[PDB]
Structure 1
C-alpha cells in the first residue's frame, strides 16, 4: 500500500499494526545517504501491517505499509 519513494535507510517509523493514520500524517522518516526526507501517509486508514521497521534498508518503490483501509 504505502511505499518508499527514494533510496535510503528508514531512520524512524511511527506506525504499528492496528494503529490509525490520516493522509499527510508522518509514518516514517528516511535518512537518504545523509539527507532527510519525511514519509507521510499516502491515505487515511488503520494499519494492517508495517513492511519495514526502524533502521531497515529501503528504496524507491520498496513497500512500507499495508492498511485495512486501502483494501478498497
Structure 2
C-alpha cells in the first residue's frame, strides 16, 4: 500500500487504476503548512486502485493507493 505521511489536503493526484509507478516517482501533491509538498511512491508497481482524489482530506498513514504488487 502507499499512504500520505502528514496531515493536509491532497492538492492533486497523478495515478489511475492500471497505471504504473516506480519507487521515488511523484504520485500526488499534498497542501499543508501553507505550502505544497510532493508525494512519492514508496515502492514500484502497477496501480490496482486509488483511494483518494484531488482536494480530499488526508493524514499521516492515511492510504493513497493500492498496487498489483502490494506484497502479494
Q: With structure 2 as the length reference, what TM-score do the two structures score?
A: 0.94
Shift, 1:17, TM fit:
0.5
Q: CA RMSD in A?
A: 0.9
For residues 4-31 of structure 1, the C-alpha deviation after alignment (integer angstroms, 9 at most, x for no partner) is 0000000010000010000111000000
Structure 1, unmatched stretches of 5+, are: none
Give the distance between the partners of 1:33 and 1:54, measured in 2 at CA: 18
Shift, 1:40, TM fit:
0.4
Structure 2, unmatched stretches of 5+, are: none
How many residues are aligned here? Answer: 72
Q: Which segments of structure 1 move beyond 4 Å, counting only runs of 4 or more?
A: none
